[PDB]
């Protein structure tokens, strides 16, 4: 067969150890899920430094904790805008997920609180910025470089899926690079606990699985489709399905056809054809052998999964960092004020936060 006795024994034991790890990780997650933390700091404990990103119901600021001098990324959500835009459940769920997970590639939530106007989530600051910017700037990643990142998403999805969490918003814009060159996943607005199926139309057009487009009940296999899109975009510099308008992107996604740059290795194309598989009974990550079909694929043959998990692999790329609080890897935004009302807004809606 493909493996001699020694390699087969090693792979079998590795796979059993992963099961053992996931069982313990699911136990630790559920404890924290059932009994979450609340109100662990206050606004005047931090100095505001710079806006790192803005949205329709809040923003993310680099802040410095006064006592400890540590820098953090503080997500500020306007309670009234959250309600107007129908994001109550998503916002509470994101916080609940973040306070319960624990994994080396998931951002760590260090504090959360609220006041009359806003909700606050204080997370580790990830100074390397989004993978998106580095990818557009470099053009494309070589296959070893893309594989380094892909390996981290594989392990992170293996973790999340063992907790019955579907991520649903994978894309380079949602992947930050830390000071050691490793990935941090920070946003969980669309993640859901789904043991079986779910139905919401959500995601980003280029990364939508065909069964989401076709309004089907779907499961965690949408994340493995999205991994195929991510790997393609990292290695090509552009995604596999694009067009002027989303409807034309969706026709491409459902067609079952995909084209590859001539510089893609045959191993990479074979993996991508198995992730970007419109037929759910044939998609890698959705078969009897689960995540192992992906991890044991030829394109990952040089990947030491434990070494990646332990962050012992030398990263292909370390972002420029001139010191703590360096923000050169983030876009520049106009600094708007953080007004806090004399009157509590939306207290009932955000009671559990």
């Amino acid at each position: 067969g493909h493996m001699g006795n020694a390699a087969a024994a090693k792979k079998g034991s590795e796979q059993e150890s992963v099961k053992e790890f996931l069982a313990k990780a699911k136990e630790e997650f559920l404890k924290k899920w059932e009994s979450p933390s609340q109100n662990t700091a206050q606004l005047d404990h931090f100095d505001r430094i710079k806006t790192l990103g803005t949205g329709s119901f809040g923003r993310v600021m680099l802040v410095k904790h006064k006592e400890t001098g540590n820098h953090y990324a503080m997500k500020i959500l306007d309670k009234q805008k959250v309600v107007k835009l129908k994001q109550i459940e998503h916002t509470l769920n994101e916080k609940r997920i973040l306070q319960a997970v624990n994994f080396p590639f998931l951002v760590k939530l260090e504090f959360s609180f609220k006041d009359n106007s806003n909700l606050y989530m204080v997370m580790e600051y990830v100074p390397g910025g989004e993978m998106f910017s580095h990818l557009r700037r470099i053009g494309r990643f070589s296959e070893p470089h893309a594989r380094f990142y892909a390996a981290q998403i594989v392990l992170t999805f293996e973790y999340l899926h063992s907790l019955d969490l579907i991520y649903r918003d994978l894309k380079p814009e949602n992947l930050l690079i830390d000071q050691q060159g490793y990935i941090q996943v920070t946003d969980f607005g669309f993640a859901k606990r789904v043991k079986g199926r779910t139905w919401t139309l959500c995601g980003t057009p280029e990364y939508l699985a065909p069964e989401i487009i076709l309004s089907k009940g779907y499961n965690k296999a949408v994340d493995w489709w999205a991994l195929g899109v991510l790997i393609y975009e990292m290695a090509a510099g552009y995604p596999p399905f694009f067009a002027d308008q989303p409807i034309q992107i969706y026709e491409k996604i459902v067609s079952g056809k995909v084209r590859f740059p001539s510089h893609f290795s045959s191993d990479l194309k074979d993996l991508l054809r198995n992730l970007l598989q419109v037929d759910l009974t044939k998609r890698f990550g959705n078969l009897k052998n689960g995540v192992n079909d992906i991890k044991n694929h030829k394109w990952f043959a040089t990947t030491d999964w434990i070494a990646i998990y332990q962050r012992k692999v030398e990263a292909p790329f370390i972002p420029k960092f001139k010191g703590p609080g360096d923000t050169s890897n983030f876009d520049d935004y106009e600094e708007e004020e953080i007004r806090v009302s004399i009157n509590e807004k939306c207290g009932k809606e955000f009671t559990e936060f």
Partner: peptide, 18 residues
């Protein structure tokens, strides 16, 4: 080229969720 087609799509910038 496919790259030129990608530029022509207008979707080279940061993409938001639907």
């Amino acid at each position: 080229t496919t790259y030129a087609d990608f530029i022509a799509s207008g979707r080279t910038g940061r993409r938001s969720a639907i």
